[PDB]
Write a protein that binds this ligand. Sequence first.
Ligand SMILES: NC[C@H]1O[C@H](O[C@H]2[C@H](O)[C@@H](O[C@H]3O[C@H](CO)[C@@H](O)[C@H](N)[C@H]3O)[C@H](N)C[C@@H]2N)[C@H](O)[C@@H](O)[C@@H]1O
Ligand SMILES: Nc1nc2c(ncn2[C@@H]2O[C@H](COP(=O)(O)OP(=O)(O)NP(=O)(O)O)[C@@H](O)[C@H]2O)c(=O)[nH]1
Ligand SMILES: [Cl-]
Ligand SMILES: [Mg+2]
Ligand SMILES: [Mg+2]
Length: 292
Amino acid sequence: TNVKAMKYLIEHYFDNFKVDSIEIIGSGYDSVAYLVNNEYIFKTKFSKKGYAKEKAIYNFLNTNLETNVKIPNIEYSYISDELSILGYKEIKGTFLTPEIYSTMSEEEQNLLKRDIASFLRQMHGLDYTDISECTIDNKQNVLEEYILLRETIYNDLTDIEKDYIESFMERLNATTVFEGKKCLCHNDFSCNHLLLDGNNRLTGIIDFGDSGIIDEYCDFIYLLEDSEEEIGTNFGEDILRMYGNIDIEKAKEYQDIVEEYYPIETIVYGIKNIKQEFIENGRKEIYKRTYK
Ligand SMILES: NC[C@H]1O[C@H](O[C@H]2[C@H](O)[C@@H](O[C@H]3O[C@H](CO)[C@@H](O)[C@H](N)[C@H]3O)[C@H](N)C[C@@H]2N)[C@H](O)[C@@H](O)[C@@H]1O
Ligand SMILES: Nc1nc2c(ncn2[C@@H]2O[C@H](COP(=O)(O)OP(=O)(O)NP(=O)(O)O)[C@@H](O)[C@H]2O)c(=O)[nH]1
Ligand SMILES: [Cl-]
Ligand SMILES: [Mg+2]
Ligand SMILES: [Mg+2]
């Protein structure tokens, strides 16, 4: 019953809000999300690594997007250094999964793909001046993360681990995939964030918590992912073709680079948050990838 505490905080911070019911519907490792009154999502976090940007982004998009695809619309927010809460009406629907996709008719699949493409085209096309502050430079961030590695645990890594990192840094230095179009991206655009209605059409998109002005290629990273969690490379390829005017080969390169980085990102997260578990997981993942 983290629930009782959160109920207290909600009713305390939002003057006239009454919690008749509240259950946990999702949990990150940093955050917890709650379904309140079978109607409202409350996303909450205990510590500037908070929800101010995410709020600015919903507000920018609800103002500027013209689409029937629903996104969170923030009605309640409390933002402080130690605690952030965002409340919005739950988008209703079913989350896309590989299993579900595989039961869809070819036409249903095509329409879903089209809807996705169309959403991304609209969002990426937005004049982002009003949120110009929300920029993200992935290359620079990785360079800074590498420095942090060097200043902390690098020297205690194994040769195999070092070689995996250095081989990645060499690739990062040689790639051209950061030199293209920048635009506003969702930046965590995977199928556990996509909602379907009863006709298997795209009805909503959630979790713009990593969104920012970044490489156009970023929003295809999970659509191109080949894994148990995602639909598959062909799904992303097809979506890229529908989206148009984008170098597919570079999109795939970008995805492949971000996937190579994942275990390192996992390690860095563990260092930054003082969680050994993640440091260990990421190093182990390097070995699993090395021996594939
Ligand atoms: N779990 C196993 C899988 O993990 C990654 O893919 C998943 C990402 O981790 C998720 O994103 C999360 O992690 C990111 C940093 O990695 C964060 O930025 C983001 N805020 C988080 O929601 C994303 N939404 C779905 C995607 N399938 C690897 O690519 C994949 O090979 C591996 O099989
Ligand atoms: N049906 C539905 N579920 C939602 C909605 N918003 C959030 N959820 C559920 O709550 C979970 C957590 O939401 P999400 O924004 O992805 O937060 P997070 O990834 O756990 N936290 P963070 O983005 O800070 O890392 C989602 O995976 C989903 O299960 C919504 O509007 N509709
Ligand atoms: Cl370790
Ligand atoms: Mg999420
Ligand atoms: Mg998120």
